[PDB]
Each structure stands twice: as C-alpha cells, then as structure tokens.
Ligand binder design. Structure first.
Ligand SMILES: CCCCCCCCc1nc(-c2cc(S(=O)(=O)N3CCN(C)CC3)ccc2OCC)[nH]c(=O)c1Br
Ligand SMILES: [Mg+2]
Ligand SMILES: [Zn+2]
Length: 292
C-alpha cells in the first residue's frame, strides 16, 4: 500500500494551480484527500519552476513528498501533515499572488518551499513533548528534513552543484529555525523598526535573511488569516492539541500580540499580501464579538 501510493501519485495527472485554487490566500484543504494534497504539492514545485531549474525527476519528487507526508503524525490534532501542507500553500500564494517571488532568487524559493513543508516534521504536539531555550524542536525538525533529503530515491536536490546545495541547506535550516516562536519574538523588533523608518532593504544580505525568517512565520501562522468558517475549524484543532468559552479572548490576544503586526509588516513589503492582513483583521472582529 506504499509503492501503491507512490504508483498512483506518479501516474496521476497534475491539474493546474488555478484549478486547484492553491493561488488563493483563502485556500482550505478540508475537502482534499492525502493524494490530492500530494498533487497540489507537485503543482507548487512545478509552477515555481523548481522541477525545471533543478532537474528533478518526477518519481523522486513524488517519493520525497510522500516521505515528508509520512513523517508527520496523524494522531496529533494540529501539528500534522495538513498544517505543513497549508504552510507551504501560503508560501506559494505569497510568492505568486503576493508577488514575493520576483524579490527572491531561485535557490531561496526552493529552500522556503522545502522548509515550509518540512518545518514541523515528526512533531508530537505542544504538550506531548529545553530550559536552555535553544530551539531544540526546530533543530529536530531540520534534522528530519535533512534525513529525508538524503534518503535513497528521495534526493530532490541531487541536481544542484555542491555550492548550490550548501547554500540551500543553510537557507532551509535558518528558515526552519525561524519558526521557533521565541526566535520570531526576538527578531521582530528589528524588522518592524526598519520598515517604520523606511530603511528596509532586501539587497542587504542581513535584511534579506531577516525577511525570509518573517515570511516563514507568516506562513506558519496563516490559519489565523483564513475565512471565518475555516479559522473556526482550525482553532478547533489548535484547541484540542493544546488541551488534549475562554477561547475567543485567547484568540484576540494571540492576534494582537503576535499576528497583526507581522501581516501589517508583510503588506508594507508587498502590497499584494494584503489579503493575509485583511483576513486576520476580519477574524479579530469575529472572535472579539464572541468574547461577549
Ligand atoms: C511560528 C509559530 C510558533 C508555534 C505556535 C503554535 C500554535 C499557534 C496558535 N496559537 C493559538 C493560541 C495561543 C494562545 S497563547 O496566548 O499564545 N498561549 C500559548 C502558550 N500556552 C501554553 C498558553 C497559551 C492561546 C490560545 C490559542 O488558541 C486557542 C484556540 N491560536 C492559534 O490560532 C494558533 Br495558529
Ligand atoms: Mg513549529
Ligand atoms: Zn508550524
């Protein structure tokens, strides 16, 4: 039932990005089977021109996607394959519809897509899990990512040169590390401060790296931006993982403390990322109304 899954995936037709709606910031995955998410994931790679520019063989990409999917735990309510899949979908939408793509190199785009998909690998749940605060969990996710990338039949980066490979690995690792909330909160001020003074510049390597970090977090939290019926559903998953009527005020606090400023910053960098900011605002209104 495993080469069977790979067999079906590799033989399947891959519908267009438009058809699959993966270009929409409002995308949801509730009605999709695992096979269909795999198909959407192929489409993200091919439409970012990654299959072409880095010579990936179809059967390798398919095997790699299936390995990644398999190394998330289904019994974990929120931190599972569908979350990673959604995080990647948002990266794709921000690159395409949000027009971030033109601001980045091909290697950067390759790394973010892989990192988005891999960023929570083997997660066991926020409770089912350090005093050092050295991003232990994120190191483990990257380690898992690297292992899958090096597995026989799964080497989607085999087509890159040695120098290519090292730089993309570095970006992938920084990107996954960035998804540690502690790190996001540390580095936030700098990003906000820079945009505040109109001093933000992507040509500076350091600010470029800072932006990739912020982008990762924006995609990671992207459920908070979804249409109301979708956000309510995802909040339901987050709630069961966390505690495996006080929820509305919690959601408002979360949106204020962590989310709103990020999506505001993102829209300054790219106007077309506005729908994430807008969606987050509409959700704040809805949760706040419930808070009474
Ligand atoms: C890069 C992001 C880091 C990992 C974050 C893990 C999950 C994020 C999340 N967290 C919350 C949330 C966050 C909080 S909280 O105020 O930040 N808080 C979080 C830590 N906790 C053990 C106590 C409560 C409380 C309730 C929440 O949701 C209940 C439905 N809500 C969300 O919609 C989302 Br999405
Ligand atoms: Mg994480
Ligand atoms: Zn995550």
């Amino acid at each position: 039932e495993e080469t069977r899954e790979l067999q079906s995936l590799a033989a399947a037709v891959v519908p267009s990005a438009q058809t699959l709606k993966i270009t929409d910031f409002s995308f949801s995955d509730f009605e999709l089977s695992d096979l269909e998410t795999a198909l959407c994931t192929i489409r993200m790679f091919t439409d970012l021109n990654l299959v072409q520019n880095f010579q990936m063989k179809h059967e390798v990409l398919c095997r790699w996607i299936l390995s990644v999917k398999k190394n998330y735990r289904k019994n974990v309510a929120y931190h599972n394959w569908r979350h990673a899949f959604n995080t990647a979908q948002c990266m794709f939408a921000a690159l395409k519809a949000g027009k971030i793509q033109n601001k980045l190199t091909d290697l950067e785009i390759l790394a973010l897509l892989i990192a988005a998909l891999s960023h929570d690998l083997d997660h066991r749940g926020v409770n089912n899990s350090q005093l050092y605060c050295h991003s232990i969990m994120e190191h483990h996710h990257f380690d898992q990512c690297l292992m899958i990338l090096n597995s026989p039949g799964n080497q989607i980066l085999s087509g890159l040169s040695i120098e290519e490979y090292k730089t993309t690995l570095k970006i992938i690792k920084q990107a996954i590390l960035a998804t540690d909330l502690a790190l996001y909160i540390k580095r936030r001020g700098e990003f906000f401060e820079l945009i505040r003074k109109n001093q933000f510049n992507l040509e500076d390597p350091h600010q470029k790296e800072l932006f990739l970090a912020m982008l990762m977090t924006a995609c990671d939290l992207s459920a908070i931006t979804k249409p109301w019926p979708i956000q309510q559903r995802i909040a339901e998953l987050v709630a069961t993982e966390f505690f495996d009527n006080k929820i509305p005020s919690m959601q408002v606090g979360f949106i204020d403390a962590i989310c709103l400023q990020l999506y505001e910053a993102l829209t300054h960098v790219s106007e077309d990322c506005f729908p994430l900011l807008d969606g987050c605002r509409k959700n704040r209104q809805k949760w706040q109304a419930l808070a009474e």
